[PDB]
Structure formats: C-alpha cells, structure tokens
Structure 1
Amino acid sequence: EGYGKHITSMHVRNIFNQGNQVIRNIVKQQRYELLDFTGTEAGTTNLPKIIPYQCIWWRGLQNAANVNQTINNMIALNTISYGVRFLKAKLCIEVYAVTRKRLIQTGATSYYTDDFEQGQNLFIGWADRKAESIPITTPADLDETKLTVANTTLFDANNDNITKEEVPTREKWCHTWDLDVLNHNYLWEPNNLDSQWTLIPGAQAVQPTATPIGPTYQEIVIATKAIGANESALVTTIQDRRSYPRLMLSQPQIKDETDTMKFKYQIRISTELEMEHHIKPDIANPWLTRQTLPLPALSGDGTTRYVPCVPYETHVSQ
C-alpha cells in the first residue's frame, strides 16, 4: 500500500468531458444612427423603416465597420463549439433627438430648414395584425435605416392594423425575445452569422415556396445531416411555434400643405443577443451533430429573399 499523502485507490476516472461546458457569450451592437424620412433616395423616403430582427442582423452585418469583438468572440467560439442556443435577444431603441425639415420659400429659392419637435414621437410599429415580409438582397439591406418596403405605412385611413408605440425623445423602447425554442436538449449549429438570408430561431411555419427552407421552421423538425459521406444523422425535435411580426419604425403621418410633413430622428439602437455556446468536447465526436440542426435560412438561387414576418399565433383553449 502506498504511503503518500495524496495516495488514493483508483476510482473509474476519465477527465475528458462530454461537452457539458457552456460559455454564455453575448453579441452586442450599439449604434447611433439616422432615420431620415426627408429624402427621395431609397430608405430616406417617408416609408416606414423596418427592423429585420428575423434576419439576425444582431451580428451587425448591415455594415462591416460595426463589428466589435463580441462577434470576434462568437466567430471564435463557433470554431470550438458544436452547438449553440440563443437564450435571449434584447433590443433597445433610444430617441435622442427629433427633427423635421420645414419648407421655406423666398425669391423662388424654395429651400428647407430643420426644427426640433419635443412633442412628437417615434412610432414603433408592429405587424401584429397582418402578415408581411421583408425583402432581402444584400447584408446592406439589413440596415434598419435604409430598409423600406414600397407602398407600406403604419397609417391606413381605411383600416389601421398596426400596433404602435410612440417613443418620445429622451425615452427608450426596450423589447426582448426569448430565442431558446429547442427542447429535448437539441442545439443550433454554430454560425458566424455572415449571411443575411439566414434567419432567427423560432418556428414560423411559413416559408416561401420560391426559397424552400426545409424543416427547421416546423414545430416538429424532420431532418437529416451529412456528417461525412459514410454516415448520416437524423435530427428530430419539437420546437415551440413563434411569431415575429414585422417591426417597423416610422414618423407620424402629418398631412402638410405639401406632401405629408417629413421628420428625421437620431436614435441609438442597442442590440445584445445572448448566446450559450456548448463547446466541442475534449475528444472529437463529429456525431454530436445529432443534437444540432442548422439555423433557418432562405435557400434559393434568387438574388432576393422574402422572410416571413408572420404576426401572431392564435391560442386555443385546451
């Protein structure tokens, strides 16, 4: 018998883990940006300005210069992680200033000037009553400033469907999503989120026929995975339905002597998406993908992509 101080008989011991380790990263993006309803150019128009939180721009793809390190952390962790679960998403819009171009006419100059409105607000619209979609072409289109849809508005005199929440200056609007829909201990494939036509977790059973997504929107997923040419994994899980109504920013519609008085806003968009990275285990186990199903994405040859914004889910008594 060994007399050492630390001596103890061997219990069955293997230190290598099974993947129980979880890093709980957050990916933050914080942006002070312009909302311009004045101009005639693209997203500067009077049209509402969409927030495509379905398109998982939380990465901050709409520009390459907004990458912070939280991404650079996510990019790394996705290298060492077999799977991920997004357990929260926190969106907060601050309204610092409000501004509107007043029209001035002198000597047929017909120039403009800007005025502060402390009494008007920023209307945050929801599609919650209607079914709508977001056209997507390039990551740039994910910019919530310059993103628009033609002939769309938050104000329809015939029927007003939108659910609206007005944000004054010196006031913030913070909405939060719970993005862990995956029961039975399934996870999301690691993604560095370099694709705009990729989408957010949650099950909107709708998918465009022109861009068939596959099962991952189903409330029950029936899917397969390659895991090499020799093997295949059958990924099968339940995930709760989720409805992500189109989130639209807009000014009030003020009929003015000429054409619907225009405002412009200064806001700070604060986005922190919370991710739990389940790191790859100490030993290679490619078959862990049996627990992972890819992030939903719009697959197709087209240059443009229409994401379902589907507003809501009826609740039936049971």
Structure 2
Amino acid sequence: QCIWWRGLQNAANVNQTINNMIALNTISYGVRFLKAKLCIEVYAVTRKRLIQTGATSYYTDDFEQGQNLFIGWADRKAESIPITTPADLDETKLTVANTTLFDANNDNITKEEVPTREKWCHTWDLDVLNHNYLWEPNNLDSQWTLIPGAQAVQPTATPIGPTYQEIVIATKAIGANESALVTTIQDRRSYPRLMLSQPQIKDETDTMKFKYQIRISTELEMEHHIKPDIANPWLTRQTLPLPALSGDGTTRYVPCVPYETHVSQ
C-alpha cells in the first residue's frame, strides 16, 4: 500500500530503473501506474531447534521443507500499518504487536502457503483513473505516499484528501494566480493488508521459530506522459496528487481495507 516498490526502505537498493523514473518524473506532467506485480520466492525454510547439554543451551538450524511460508491477506478484517519512517517499510522487520495469522478463536485470514521451490506472485492493476486523468509525478521518496486506488477510509488524524474517494474534488495551486479544479471518478479499491508468517506451533514453551530465505521480486509498470514540447503549466488540471498520509504525525496508519462488497443492480 505504501509506495515501497522503489525499495525506499533502504538507499542501498537503487536500480538505474528508479534513476530513470526520477528523470522521467522531471520531464513528465503526469503518470498512471499499472500492473504492479509482486512475486515472492522461497529458497529455504529454516527452523531453530533448541538444544541443551545441561550445562548450557544453544540453538541450531535445520531444514524443514514440509513446512512452508504463508501469505496472509488480512482480508475480512480491518487492519492498518504504522509507518514511522521509510526504514520501517522493510517487510522483514515490519511487524504489528499482538497480531497473527492463526487465531485460535476466529480465523479471519485468507492465506496461501508458499513452498520453497514454488513462487507466489500476485498482481495489481493500478490504473483506476478514468476521464483522462493522471497522477502527479512523484519520485516516491516519501513512504507516506500511498499507491493509486481509492480505499475511502482515512485516519482523521492524518487526512488524506480527496484522492481515496471515487468522486475527487481538489483545488490545485498552479501559482499564486491560477487554481485548478480536479474532478475525477475512480473505482473504490480495497488493498487489504498483506503479510507473511511462519506456522504457529506451540511445541515446548514458546512456539517454534522459523526463518525463511526469500527473493521478493517487484515490477511496477509506470506510463509517464512526458511534458509537451511547449511549457503548459496548466496540464495539472488533469493530474491529481498521489494519496499521502498528512499531518504532523510521525507515525501514520494506512487503512488497508480488506474488501469491497458487491451489490446487484
């Protein structure tokens, strides 16, 4: 949900691709994201087996291929992601206290289990916008910037603005002289919270502890509409900014609504 496809959680990962987008966003008046593709691979599954010599206890790591990684969708539930900083986006170190996929009383999660040699790869269609509108070019250097698509929920402590509601209304300031009125119809999009977890197994004392090796592949297709040959400052009327968590708040919560109901006509 955060624009993490740039790998903003770390500066050590910048592919020339990102360096292209940074450039193309200088020469483009607007962009429309599409076909964001998340593709995950599990090379290994490793469990920490406690051991005791009776003098001391040391841990070792063994391969369990039978067990496998789980892809939680956090569907059928309303859960948000705290974001303090971009480093917090790292899915390896990102967690929410008192959350689990396996809930003994009521299991609300749809989850697909990913074995080692099988790769789990999901795709999002990020072009919601119609009526010939586009997204303001963003180098995606801010994590509070959230993907296209409208999940109408916003924290009142961090007002998004119009960009999560199907019917958009915004007054953009081109300059001191000219405001622009942007109005668009985009479809409500859910974007449930997606999470990864190990099997929950009580074993002895605390639950079993697995550590997975994965290769997480990402493709975010972006169509940049380049600025015209002659400067038009007023193309902005077709561009509306990316949704972003606003406010003075250091930590900010993305809605991640699970799903949208469907109604017959």
* Same fold at TM > 0.5: yes
SS at match of 1:77: helix
* Alpha-carbon shift at residue 89 of structure 1 (Å): 0.2
Mapping of residues 118-267 of structure 1, within 5 Å = 118-267=65-214
CA separation in 2, counterparts of 1:121 and 1:103? 20
Residues 223-248 of structure 1: CA distance to partner in whole angstroms, max 9, x if unpaired? 01000000010000000010011001
* Alpha-carbon shift at residue 127 of structure 1 (Å): 1.1
SS at match of 2:223: strand
CA separation in 2, counterparts of 1:262 and 1:112? 11
Q: Which residue of 35, 40, 46 maps to 1:99?
A: 46
* Alpha-carbon shift at residue 108 of structure 1 (Å): 2.5
Residues 122-169 of structure 1: CA distance to partner in whole angstroms, max 9, x if unpaired? 000011110000000010000000000000000110000000100001
* Runs (4+) off by over 4 Å: none
The TM-score with structure 2 as length reference comes to 0.99
SS at match of 2:154: coil
* Alpha-carbon shift at residue 258 of structure 1 (Å): 1.9
* Alpha-carbon shift at residue 107 of structure 1 (Å): 3.0
The TM-score with structure 1 as length reference comes to 0.83
Q: What percent of counterpart residues are identical?
A: 100
In our comparison, the structure showing a higher alpha carbon Rg is 1
Gaps of 5+ in 1: 1-53
* Alpha-carbon shift at residue 256 of structure 1 (Å): 1.0
CA separation in 2, counterparts of 1:121 and 1:114? 15
Gaps of 5+ in 2: none
CA separation in 1, counterparts of 2:9 and 2:110? 26
SS at match of 1:128: coil
Compute the RMSD of aligned alpha carbons.
Answer: 0.5
Q: Number of matched residues?
A: 265
* Alpha-carbon shift at residue 88 of structure 1 (Å): 1.1
Residues 169-189 of structure 1: CA distance to partner in whole angstroms, max 9, x if unpaired? 111000000000000010000
CA separation in 2, counterparts of 1:240 and 1:107? 62
Residues 166-217 of structure 1: CA distance to partner in whole angstroms, max 9, x if unpaired? 0001110000000000000100000000001110000000000000110011
Task: State the match for 2:262 in structure 1.
Answer: 315
> Structure 1 stretch 101-110 or stretch 199-208: which is displaced more?
101-110
SS at match of 2:153: coil
Task: State the match for 2:229 in structure 1.
Answer: 282
CA separation in 1, counterparts of 2:202 and 2:34? 43
Residues 52-99 of structure 1: CA distance to partner in whole angstroms, max 9, x if unpaired? xx0010011010011101100000000000000001100000000000
